[PDB]
Amino acid sequence: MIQSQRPMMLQSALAFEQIIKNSKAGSGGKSQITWDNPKELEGYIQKLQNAAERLATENRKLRKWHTTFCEKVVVLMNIDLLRQ
Amino acid sequence: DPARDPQYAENEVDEMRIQKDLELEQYKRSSSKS
Incomplete structure (x- = not known):
């Protein structure tokens, strides 16, 4: 989860850890x-x-989602605004 | 703050870095007298 740093996963993972700790x-x-x-x-x-x-x-x-956003960004940087 | 230093990415920034350098270096080599 630390590969993305999105609380969506870091915060709920702590809730899971709490279940484990319990x-x-x-x-x-x-x-x-x-x-x-x-x-x-x-x-x-x-x-x-x-x-x-x-x-x-x-x-x-x-x-x-991580893959989805990565793929679109890597395409956009290769688009010349003056042509495409 | 265009640096965007307190951030991390692997594929996005690497490819942008490579492309950024390759294009700019080619335009410099064109040796325009302008």
């Missing part, structure tokens, strides 16, 4: 879930994955 508050205990019963961890992961899906969608839109 789970991380119990990291000491998460370290022992899978060994005995992985279902609890599955819940924690699904929560993070739902956030990841939302952020991944925004990333794809961002990458799409």
Whole structure:
């Protein structure tokens, strides 16, 4: 996301990080879930994955737009105003 | 502030830089007496 510096992505990524941190508050205990019963961890992961899906969608839109604007600008600079 | 220094771009500014130099240098070489 730092490749574009658009808050659209930097700010919502922090919200995702917050979801991660909320789970991380119990990291000491998460370290022992899978060994005995992985279902609890599955819940924690699904929560993070739902956030990841939302952020991944925004990333794809961002990458799409970034390319779109780049392509048009690189053409405009090659247009001679006196001819075209 | 035409410099636009506190900004970053890779493909846009590189290609503009290259094209900017190539055209201006050719016009200088024309060695017009004007």
